[PDB]
């Protein structure tokens, strides 16, 4: 149980911190009426799949 719980903590923390990195990298583009730079979009997926 201890090893399993530590493994779950590791995986959740890592995935959450990737999500935070995603939002921080993509945050300035949601404050301008600009393009998403498909080079960034393809590597880094976002909620807007096609719009904006």
């Amino acid at each position: 149980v201890g090893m399993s719980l530590l493994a779950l903590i590791s995986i959740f923390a890592s995935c959450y911190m990737l999500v935070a990195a995603r939002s921080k990298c993509l945050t300035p583009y949601a404050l301008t009426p600009g393009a998403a730079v498909p080079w960034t979009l393809g590597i880094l997926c976002c909620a807007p799949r096609a719009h904006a």
Binding site: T27, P28, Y29, A30, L31, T32, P33, G34, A35
Partner: protein, 161 residues
């Protein structure tokens, strides 16, 4: 003429923010984004703008949202060019020199955050956050735009209005 255009554009593109029965700031409609100073606490005085999802960026001190369609026509048009000189504002004129926006008069008061700065064409250039009192002048801690990057310029001693 320019003052009249600024006045109607502001009236069609500015809404006050209500908190505890007192105004805390203004929310403006530029292009396709509603902006609000993050440090300003309150709720926008509009039912449609009340329920929108707001995306916050504290390192930029700004909260941005997407306008409902029936209001996208009531938004000012923007620009990314900042030639040296002077520009319009709700309290008169502002001086853009050396990458610094200066209030000649120091007439800003707390709670005026969120009022747009206008171009000589009536286009929006920047949204004020606060002022720093240097001598008799007031440098502007303000949020402006690059080609596609938002930049929050802030002088030393600035106070969040």
């Amino acid at each position: 003429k320019r003052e009249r255009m600024c006045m109607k554009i502001e009236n069609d593109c500015i809404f006050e923010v209500k908190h505890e029965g007192k105004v805390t700031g203004y929310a403006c409609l530029v292009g396709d984004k509603v902006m609000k100073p993050a440090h300003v606490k309150g709720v926008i005085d509009n039912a449609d703008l009340a329920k929108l999802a707001f995306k916050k960026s504290s390192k930029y001190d700004l909260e941005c949202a997407q306008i409902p369609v029936h209001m996208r026509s009531d938004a000012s048009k923007y620009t990314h060019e900042k030639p040296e000189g002077h520009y319009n504002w709700h309290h008169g004129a502002v001086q853009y020199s050396g990458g610094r926006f200066t209030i000649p008069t120091g007439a800003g008061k707390p709670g005026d955050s969120g009022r747009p700065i206008f171009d000589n064409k009536g286009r929006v250039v920047a949204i004020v956050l606060g002022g720093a009192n240097e001598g008799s002048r007031t440098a502007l801690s303000v949020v402006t735009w690059n080609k596609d990057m938002v930049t929050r310029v802030t002088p030393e001693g600035s106070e969040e209005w």
